[PDB]
Design a protein around this ligand. Sequence first.
Ligand SMILES: c1ccn(-c2ccc(N3CCOCC3)cc2)c1
Ligand SMILES: *[C@@H]1O[C@H](CO)[C@@H](O)[C@H](O)[C@H]1NC(C)=O
Length: 352
Amino acid sequence: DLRLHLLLNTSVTCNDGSPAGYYLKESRGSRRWLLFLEGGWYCFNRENCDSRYDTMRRLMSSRDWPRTRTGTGILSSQPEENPYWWNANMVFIPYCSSDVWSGASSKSEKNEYAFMGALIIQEVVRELLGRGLSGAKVLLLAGSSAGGTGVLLNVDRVAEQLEKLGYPAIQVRGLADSGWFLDNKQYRHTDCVDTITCAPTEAIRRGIRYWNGVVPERCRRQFQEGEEWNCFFGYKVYPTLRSPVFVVQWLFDEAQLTVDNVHPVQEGLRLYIQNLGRELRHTLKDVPASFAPACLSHEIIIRSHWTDVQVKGTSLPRALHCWDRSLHPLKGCPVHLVDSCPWPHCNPSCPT
Ligand SMILES: c1ccn(-c2ccc(N3CCOCC3)cc2)c1
Ligand SMILES: *[C@@H]1O[C@H](CO)[C@@H](O)[C@H](O)[C@H]1NC(C)=O
């Protein structure tokens, strides 16, 4: 079990002003630290944040959080369930800012909600340095879904933070799971009038202004004012990053299909789905550390059965271990694993 700690800096808050926090399970014989960012969509104006507060309140507030959480998947401490990093120090950071981990705005007389995701990550790192992170050799910032996008937005800032605090020897790395989205043509189209009709490009454009959102500096300098929404899309922000990042992405991700307005498949939709897999595979061609199976699913790394899926005969825990070795090609230890077959479940190891 991981144990809850609320942030001692009470100015760093969830959406409703309650303190943010993190769950921690220490491994005092280890110099490896895993910091995982939870996912779960976002909200981008007063009306849809209000609805989220009614029926998704654990993603907006710490008031009802439990004292412990059980580590699963890559956060498990049992080698049987986690062949990769079972002996690491484990941290789970709840997502209570609804801003894809980009916000830097407090609640105030002009802001009904606080959006502090980028500042929550910075403060968790600061407070952990007093609980053993000062002696780390590797800090892996990982995340699933909106938390995977959060890795891409924040990994270089954690690296910069640790250098300025005087810890240049800690190697900062990223692991982005199910957060590599395409701003592609939708299968059916709706103008942006309300939450369900707003495509991500338009929703994130509005969100950045509502959240006071921040993006990585080199990507910001490329796209400039009014176009920072581009940095929320992996294939555009990844080439600007200096930290090593491993990318996990299902080729037919269910969240991608939902934003594309896709729910007996005839020719038009068959061609649409095959083209989506082709484009995703193309965006990963020059990503040397990546795992991309031909499955219809969403998220993987905190699932207890994450060990079961394979690409070209190699599991995800093995590919991550091969990545570790490569950061000291390897015979029989690959790091770039992308399926080439063109339909969901053409890989027999896909989740049921
Ligand atoms: C660019 C940056 C983030 N995204 C993104 C994040 C989450 C989602 N999903 C949340 C749950 O349901 C809708 C789909 C979709 C797109 C796109
Ligand atoms: C508390 O967090 C705020 C927001 O990032 C920051 O400006 C302030 O310096 C922090 N205070 C301390 C004592 O770390």
